[PDB]
Structures are given as structure tokens and as C-alpha cells.
Ligand binder design. Structure first.
Ligand SMILES: *[C@@H]1O[C@H](CO)[C@@H](O[C@@H]2O[C@H](CO)[C@@H](O[C@H]3O[C@H](CO[C@H]4O[C@H](CO)[C@@H](O)[C@H](O[C@H]5O[C@H](CO)[C@@H](O)[C@H](O)[C@@H]5O[C@H]5O[C@H](CO)[C@@H](O)[C@H](O)[C@@H]5O)[C@@H]4O)[C@@H](O)[C@H](O[C@H]4O[C@H](CO)[C@@H](O)[C@H](O)[C@@H]4O[C@H]4O[C@H](CO)[C@@H](O)[C@H](O)[C@@H]4O)[C@@H]3O)[C@H](O)[C@H]2NC(C)=O)[C@H](O)[C@H]1NC(C)=O
Ligand SMILES: O=C1N=C(N2CCCC2)S/C1=C\c1ccc(Oc2ccccc2)cc1
Ligand SMILES: [Ca+2]
Ligand SMILES: [Cl-]
Ligand SMILES: [K+]
Ligand code: NA
Ligand SMILES: [Zn+2]
Length: 804
């Protein structure tokens, strides 16, 4: 109930919302059906429009007008944004040459540069270049401030997940808004774009920027606007707030535009009807910048022009129907569209089975435009598993396509030409970032970054301590002139052991055999030097990874590779080796095909054994350092040590052997050498974090050898590829992957063909940031380089996307 008999007199767009049943006058009262009876009359005036004309100059103040051109309006802070241009001979902001803002130039009483966020829905990244002719204001912000070629949204590339990710710095699995439509089984409640459940605060996790500011004494304007409030009124409200007295004036604000997303759905991303929405966005930006100039704030405020996601060409005829795949269509609930989420229609149905659903959706049609996943098998870069609102069964839908349950859902629920929601590495889903102001850099282009990183920067801009989030604080320091956050490397928690030769061969009973008894002072001092680390500078280029948790492990040196061997997990946590451009690929000699050798540096009790692999009919093994890349026949025996062995399904060994035999050499040729760090990952609860020992759900049969869920590799080289990987003087270049360790290749529909037709495609889909691997392993890489730590943090957040 709301007693709407109160009045908004003197309360238009008040900043604290008053509790029911007293009537509200804030910018969200419409959305709650709770405004006072006179809100429209007093707070949403429209008379005479939004622009001063020559004849309105010096007028007598008429309070009925939407904005004012009278002489007192600057003091009252309610001029039309073009007042000084029309009435006082001033120029529009966009017509001024841009001049470097070296220091904040603020009116007295401003304690910090205000932050104004200008967020645009569906602003695809290529609009900045393709629409530049009709967006002069936005183009001046872009070219004179700091900008990225594009900003990567989060998956799913929907509106609410990405807006709340921007506000919190969290993956949607963590902040809880995992789609535009959700069902929460603990609540037994459903979240929808239309309706009032979405207003319930239990859906919204984390701590968004406006809460972080408020709790630390930084006042915030209210970020959200009821849809019927026109853009001109939102701009005027923000400008009016900026004229408030110092003790009442907010320091952070947000404007939101439902365009160009609204038209993009109707006409497609580049339909001829899209030019006018782009013009109107720019005009609104011009009004804000003109308004800031009037208030003498255009060289004081930091402005962020940021989008939530892009837009793709999608039509009704490009729809896949689950009725063409499933017999039991009526027993599932499908969350449809640019992604698919499937669950049982009724929890009292125990004839429901996800295994048969997935199989019926797997590689069933030659041109199939979606791929089913159990959510824990989705690429780890999507970080879309660890929430009860994310259904076990997920469909990754091809760009430009939709998935629906039945054909009647599409014509009884074409009427659209654009949509979004696809995989967040898709080019059409990318969106924009521009930073403009005293704290941002001048005329600076920064590399693409992910929108999860913005929350830290916005906290930096306001002097706030960020709540715990998924950005890497300091990775965007290169965007800022000042206010940078200078992080320290995390301290290493576990220091390694350096075992020498401590065990005789006969102490081992592992069931392993190797034909290695075929057998100097020349190359016997040499092999001693290698086992003591004499080639470690070549294969450990950036220092040893730091172990950031309490564990027991050994450093093992070899001619061709170095490893950190875990005595808890009975396998390396990491294996590091350098492959130069000139390195040659050899084969595994016939007599060494099944060779596995005890490591006389590591006790039998802390070693794997070959008998377990023999007895386990499902599990084979592979090697982290590849025997194919041994530098010499004698060095190849090191690659068969029991301490270099990891459990692998035979189906995965197809992938791994092709990567080790073919791709590493190809990358070394293309990048002028590469350094490779490979290892296992255990994430059985799919939370993105390293599993403790008591969370492992599968072992090699009859043993304590834990089975990894994933295998990673970090492949580093010199950004200036005229320099070899091991003699690099400047910035580095990296690509990484987190390959799921699966007993089948059902994910790859062409896997019965040669590995040259499908393996690299699979690896590209599971590309990863170094930072993702750090979360999954508890390791810290790149500890010893010549580069600044902030640059290294940027490198760790880089994602090689393989888009064009
Ligand atoms: C991205 O960044 C985020 C943020 O840093 C990070 O997420 C954090 O991960 C932490 C480790 O997993 C986790 O730590 C403790 O969580 C609870 C307390 O959490 C509550 O308090 C915080 C602080 O305000 C809230 O933010 C949090 O909100 C969560 O839950 C709400 C719904 O309940 C929801 O609004 C919100 O979205 C958020 O949900 C998300 O996180 C939860 C997990 O908290 C998931 O379940 C959701 O799916 C969603 O993803 C909560 O309100 C502590 O109680 C934990 O302590 C455990 O474990 C300890 C292990 O050392 C142990 O010492 C304790 O005894 C305790 O165990 C108890 O519970 C066990 C399991 O229930 C039980 O077996 C045992 O017997 C015992 O009873 C954690 O120490 C943070 O909460 C979490 N924060 C957020 C905001 O998510 C992400 O990890 C990264 N992502 C990546 C990839 O890096
Ligand atoms: O007024 C609004 N109407 C909205 N709608 C959603 C679809 C239907 C109407 S969202 C909205 C405002 C809003 C402003 C800022 C937000 O957080 C950010 C964004 C960028 C950077 C930092 C923080 C989040 C939301
Ligand atoms: Ca885990
Ligand atoms: Cl959704
Ligand atoms: K086996
Ligand atoms: Na297959
Ligand atoms: Zn949309």
C-alpha cells in the first residue's frame, strides 16, 4: 500500500527513498507505482521543451517550464543545457579543441572529482568506428580521453548480468544475476524482466558501487531511472544534483540509456534505422557535456562512457527446436534464446535423466547450431557454473541463432532482427569503454579488457576500498593518470624442497619397467649439473611459480625441463620448459614406448605406480614435459620419470599428444620460441578455485593418485618476435588454455577424424587467462621478470580469443 496523498513539493528526485506507505518522489517511484499524486506535475515538467531559443533569453522565470533560460537559472542550477550557447555567446563543448586535463579544475568546495557513468544498452563496439560520422560528442570523448578498441562483457551477454557485473566486479555466478530469467530452487522463486520479484533484494549479491560509496562516506546519486523518465530529464536531474550544497552533493552518478539496444532488436545491429538512435545518444552526451561546461565542471568530472554488451543479427528462421531432437519435450523446462538452460519440468518425475537429454542433443544434425554441456564442462573462461540458479544442462548457441523448445513458442509467445546473449568472446557481443577526465590519461588507447575490471577502477576514481571482486586490482593502472593502486606480489606460503639422490632403484615397487639399462667423465659431470639446475635459466624464464597455500612439494631439475612436484597429489603442480624456434621434434623410440622410470630423488611412498594404471581399465597416463621435444636421446630418459607422469583418459591423450607433438613446435616456429608451463587442475566443485585434497571425487583405481578435471598450459614468448623467447628484453606475449580432462570427445563432433581437423578448434574454445589458471591452482606466475608488476597483472588478465 502507498498513501499517495503526500506531495513532491520540494522533493523532486530526492536522494533518500522514504519507506511505505508514505509516497515517494525519487527517480524509481514510478516503477513501484508509489509516486506522490503530483510527481508528474512538479517533477516531470515538459513545457517549452529542452532547449533555449533566442527569445527565451533573459525571460522571467516561469516554473512550469521543463528547463529555464532566465538570468537566475545558473544560480538555481536548472538552465537548459544549451543556455550559455544560445543566450551568452558560448560554444558547445564538442566544438572546443580538446586540451589536456593535467589537474582537476573544480569549483571550490569539491573534495574530489565527481564520477559520472554514462551506460548505454546494446552499444556494440564497432559502433565507435562505423557510427563515428554521426556521433561527434562521443567521438571527442573517445579520441581525447582514454579508450579501448572494445571491452569484453561477461557471459551470458545479457543486460542485467552485465550491468550488475559492471557495478560489482563479480562474475554473474557470484553476484547471482545469471540471466535475464532465473529460477532459484532454494527460494522457490522466479526472476523475470517484467514483474516485481526482480525488485526483491535477495537476488542481488555482492556489493555494487553505489553501496560501496555510501558505506565509505561517499554520497551517490541513485543510478536507476524509471523507463518513462525521458533522457533529457535524467541529464537535468544529474546536473541539478551537481548544484547541491557540498554536504548534500553526491560524488558518483549514473545515466542509463535503453538505446541503441531497443532499436537494435527490431532492426539488427546495422539496419539503416540505427543511425538515428546513435545520433540521439550523441545529442544526450552533448547535453551533459554542455551542462557540465555551464557548471564549470567539464575539466573536473571524470566521465565513463560504457556499454553492457553488443548486438548480433538474429532472425526467427534461424531457430533450433528441441522438439526435433527430444522425444520427451514436454518433460523439460527450457530457458530459451541466445543461450539454453534446461531442467526437469517437475521434481516429482524420477524418469527424468540429464544423461539421456545431453546424448539426444549431441552432434545429432550435421549443421547443428548449438552444443549441449553439463555446466561444469563449459569453458572455464565463462565462469558460469557455481550457482544454484544455473541449470546443470546448458546449450551454447551459435552466433546468429536461437534455441527454442517447440515451434509454437516462436509464433505464439519475424518480429525481431537482432539479439545478444552469446559467448562473450564473440566479436558482435563486444561493447565499448571510454574514460574522460582529470584522472584518466590523455589521448590514450589501451588494449581490450574485461568489464569485471572496471569496479576496481571506479573505486580508485572515488578513493574507495573495493569490496572483494573478480577483477585483478592494478591490471588497469595504465588507464589512469593518477590514483593508481600499487599492489604487492602475494607472499609465497610454501617453500620447496630440493631433493638430491636419496633412493636406490630396488627400493621402488611400482610395477614400472623401462629398457634403460643400455649404457664416462665428460657427460657425467654434465648430467650432475643438469640435475642440480644448470639449465634452469633456459627453462624457467620468469622465476619459479609461487605456491600460495600450505603444501609439501619438491623442485626437480632436468636438462630440458623443471617441475614443482607435489608430494600430496603425487604429480607436478607445474612443469616449465622452453622450446626454441630451432628445436626439432623426434619420436618416442620403439624400445621406450611403455618406459616409466622411478625418480631416485622421490620416495616410493610419494610416487605414482604403473600397476594402478594397468588395473584401471579406464585411465591411461601421459607426460607433462613431452618426450617428443627432448633435446637429445639421453635427455629423453628424463621425460619418462614417474615424476613427469599424469593420469589421462585415452580420449584425452589424443588431444594432449597432438598438442605436445605438433602444436608446441608450431607455436615455437611462429612466435620465435616459446616457454611452456603445463600442469593439472582439480576443480570438482566447479567454483573456479583449486580443490583441497578432500574435495577430489575420482582417483586412479586402487590408488591415491587424484584425477585432474583439467590440464592447463601457459605459453609465453616475446611480444617483439624478432627476439627469441629466452632472450626477450621487453613486454611478453602469452596465450593459455584450460582443457577439460574428459573420457570422451563428444564435445568435438569431428573427433573421429584426424586430430589436425578438430584438436586446435577445441583448444581455442578453451582459451584462458593466466589469472584463471592461478585461481584454479593456487600458483602465482611471472614472479621474476624485468617488467613492472602492473604490466604483469595486465598480462595475466589477457585472453587470446582467436576472433578476427
Ligand atoms: C570472485 O570473487 C568472489 C568475491 O571475492 C569470490 O567469492 C567468494 O568466495 C569465497 C570462497 O568461496 C566465499 O567465502 C566464504 O563464504 C561464506 C560466507 O559468505 C557469505 O558472506 C559474504 C560476505 O558478505 C557474502 O558475499 C556471501 O554472499 C553469497 O551468498 C549469497 C546467497 O547466500 C548471495 O547473495 C551472493 O551472491 C553470494 O553467492 C555466491 O557465493 C556463495 C558462496 O558464499 C555461493 O554459494 C553462490 O553460489 C554464489 O556463487 C554470503 O552471504 C563463508 O561461510 C565460507 O566459509 C566456509 O568455508 C570455509 C573454508 O575455509 C570454512 O572455514 C567455514 O567453516 C565455512 O564452512 C561452512 O560451510 C561449508 C559449506 O557451506 C560446510 O561444508 C562446513 O561444514 C561449514 O559449515 C567462505 O569462507 C565468499 O562468500 C564468496 N563471495 C562472494 C561475494 O561470492 C569468488 O571465489 C571469485 N571467483 C573466482 C573464480 O575467483
Ligand atoms: O536506469 C536504469 N534502467 C535500467 N534498466 C535495465 C533494463 C530495464 C531498465 S538499468 C539502469 C541503471 C543502471 C545504472 C548503472 C548501473 O551500474 C553500473 C553501470 C556501469 C558502470 C558502473 C555501474 C546499473 C544500472
Ligand atoms: Ca574447486
Ligand atoms: Cl537468460
Ligand atoms: K589403463
Ligand atoms: Na566426438
Ligand atoms: Zn537487448
Amino acid at each position: 500500500w502507498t498513501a499517495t496523498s503526500g506531495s513532491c513539493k520540494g522533493r523532486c528526485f530526492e536522494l533518500q527513498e522514504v519507506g511505505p506507505p508514505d509516497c515517494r518522489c525519487d527517480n524509481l517511484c514510478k516503477s513501484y507505482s508509489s509516486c506522490c499524486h503530483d510527481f508528474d506535475e512538479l517533477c516531470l515538467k515538459t513545457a517549452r521543451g529542452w532547449e533555449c531559443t533566442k527569445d527565451r533569453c533573459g525571460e522571467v522565470r516561469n516554473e512550469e517550464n521543463a528547463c529555464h533560460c532566465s538570468e537566475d537559472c545558473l544560480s538555481r542550477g536548472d538552465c537548459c543545457t544549451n543556455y550559455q550557447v544560445v543566450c551568452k555567446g558560448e560554444s558547445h563543448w564538442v566544438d572546443d579543441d580538446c586540451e589536456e586535463i593535467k589537474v582537476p579544475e573544480c569549483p571550490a568546495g569539491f573534495v574530489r572529482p565527481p564520477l559520472i557513468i554514462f551506460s548505454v544498452d546494446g552499444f556494440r563496439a564497432s559502433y565507435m568506428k562505423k557510427g563515428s560520422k554521426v556521433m561527434p560528442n562521443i567521438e571527442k570523448l573517445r579520441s581525447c580521453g582514454t579508450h579501448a578498441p572494445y571491452m569484453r562483457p561477461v557471459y551470458p551477454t545479457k543486460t542485467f548480468p552485465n550491468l550488475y557485473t559492471l557495478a560489482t566486479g563479480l562474475y554473474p555466478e557470484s553476484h547471482g544475476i545469471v540471466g535475464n530469467s532465473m529460477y532459484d530452487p532454494v527460494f522457490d522463486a522466479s526472476f523475470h524482466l517484467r514483474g516485481r520479484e526482480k525488485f526483491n533484494h535477495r537476488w542481488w549479491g555482492g556489493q555494487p558501487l553505489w553501496i560501496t560509496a555510501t558505506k565509505q562516506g561517499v554520497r551517490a546519486g541513485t543510478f536507476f531511472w524509471s523507463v518513462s523518465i525521458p533522457h533529457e530529464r535524467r541529464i537535468l536531474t544529474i546536473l541539478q544534483w551537481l548544484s547541491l550544497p557540498d554536504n548534500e552533493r553526491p560524488s558518483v552518478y549514473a545515466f542509463y540509456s535503453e538505446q541503441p539496444d531497443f532499436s537494435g532488436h527490431k532492426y539488427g545491429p546495422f539496419g539503416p534505422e540505427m543511425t538515428n538512435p546513435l545520433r540521439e545518444i550523441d545529442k544526450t552526451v552533448g547535453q551533459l557535456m554542455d551542462g557540465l561546461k555551464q557548471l564549470r565542471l567539464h575539466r573536473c568530472v571524470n566521465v565513463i562512457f560504457v556499454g553492457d554488451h553488443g548486438m548480433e543479427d538474429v532472425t526467427c528462421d534461424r531457430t533450433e527446436f528441441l522438439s526435433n531432437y527430444l522425444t520427451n519435450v514436454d518433460d523439460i523446462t527450457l530457458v530459451p534464446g541466445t543461450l539454453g538452460r534446461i531442467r526437469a519440468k517437475s521434481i516429482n518425475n524420477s524418469k527424468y535423466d540429464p544423461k539421456t537429454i545431453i546424448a539426444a542433443l549431441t552432434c545429432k544434425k550435421p549443421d547443428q547450431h548449438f552444443k549441449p554441456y553439463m555446466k561444469q564442462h563449459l569453458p572455464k573462461r565463462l565462469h558460469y557454473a557455481n550457482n544454484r540458479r544455473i541449470e546443470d544442462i546448458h546449450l551454447l548457441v551459435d552466433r546468429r541463432w536461437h534455441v527454442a523448445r517447440k515451434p509454437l513458442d516462436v509464433y505464439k509467445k519475424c518480429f525481431f532482427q537482432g539479439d545478444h546473449g552469446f559467448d562473450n568472446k564473440v566479436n558482435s557481443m563486444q561493447t565499448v569503454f571510454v574514460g574522460y577526465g582529470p584522472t584518466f590519461k590523455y589521448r590514450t588507447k589501451v588494449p581490450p579488457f574485461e568489464n569485471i575490471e572496471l569496479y576496481n577502477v571506479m573505486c580508485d576514481l572515488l578513493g574507495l576500498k573495493p569490496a572483494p571482486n573478480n577483477g585483478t586490482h592494478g591490471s588497469l593502472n595504465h588507464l589512469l593518470r593518477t590514483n593508481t593502486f600499487r599492489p604487492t606480489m602475494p607472499d609465497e606460503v610454501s617453500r620447496p624442497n630440493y631433493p638430491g639422490i636419496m633412493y636406490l632403484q630396488s627400493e621402488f615397487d611400482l610395477g614400472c619397467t623401462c629398457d634403460d639399462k643400455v649404457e664416462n667423465k665428460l657427460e657425467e659431470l654434465n648430467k650432475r649439473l643438469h640435475t642440480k639446475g644448470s639449465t634452469k635459466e633456459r627453462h624457467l624464464l620468469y622465476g619459479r611459480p609461487a605456491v600460495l597455500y600450505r603444501t609439501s612439494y619438491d623442485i626437480l631439475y632436468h636438462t630440458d625441463f623443471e617441475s614443482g612436484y607435489s608430494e600430496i597429489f603425487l604429480m607436478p603442480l607445474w612443469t616449465s620448459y622452453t622450446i626454441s624456434k630451432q628445436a626439432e621434434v623426434s619420436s618416442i623410440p620403439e624400445h621406450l614406448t611403455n618406459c616409466v622410470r622411478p625418480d631416485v630423488r622421490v620416495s616410493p611412498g610419494f610416487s605414482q605406480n604403473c600397476l594402478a594404471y594397468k588395473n584401471d581399465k579406464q585411465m591411461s597416463y601421459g607426460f607433462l614435459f613431452p618426450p617428443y621435444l627432448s633435446s637429445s636421446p639421453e635427455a629423453k630418459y628424463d621425460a619418462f620419470l614417474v615424476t613427469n607422469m599424469v593420469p589421462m583418459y585415452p580420449a584425452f591423450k589424443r588431444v594432449w599428444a597432438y598438442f605436445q607433438r605438433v602444436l608446441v613446435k608450431k607455436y615455437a616456429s611462429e612466435r620465435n620460441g616459446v616457454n611452456v608451463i603445463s600442469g593439472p587442475i582439480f576443480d570438482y566443485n566447479y567454483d573456479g578455485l583449486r580443490d583441497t585434497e578432500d574435495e577430489i571425487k575420482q582417483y586412479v583405481e586402487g590408488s591415491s593418485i587424484p584425477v585432474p578435471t583439467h590440464y592447463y598450459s601457459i605459453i609465453t614468448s616475446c611480444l617483439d618476435f624478432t627476439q627469441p623467447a629466452d632472450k626477450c628484453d621487453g613486454p611478453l606475449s602469452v596465450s593459455s588454455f584450460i582443457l577439460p580432462h574428459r573420457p570422451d570427445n563428444d564435445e568435438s563432433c569431428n573427433s573421429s577424424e584426424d586430430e589436425s581437423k578438430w584438436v586446435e578448434e577445441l583448444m581455442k574454445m578453451h582459451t584462458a587467462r593466466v589469472r584463471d589458471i592461478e585461481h584454479l591452482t593456487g600458483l602465482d606466475f611471472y614472479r621474476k621478470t624485468s617488467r613492472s608488476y602492473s604490466e604483469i597483472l595486465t598480462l595475466k588478465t589477457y585472453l587470446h580469443t582467436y576472433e578476427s
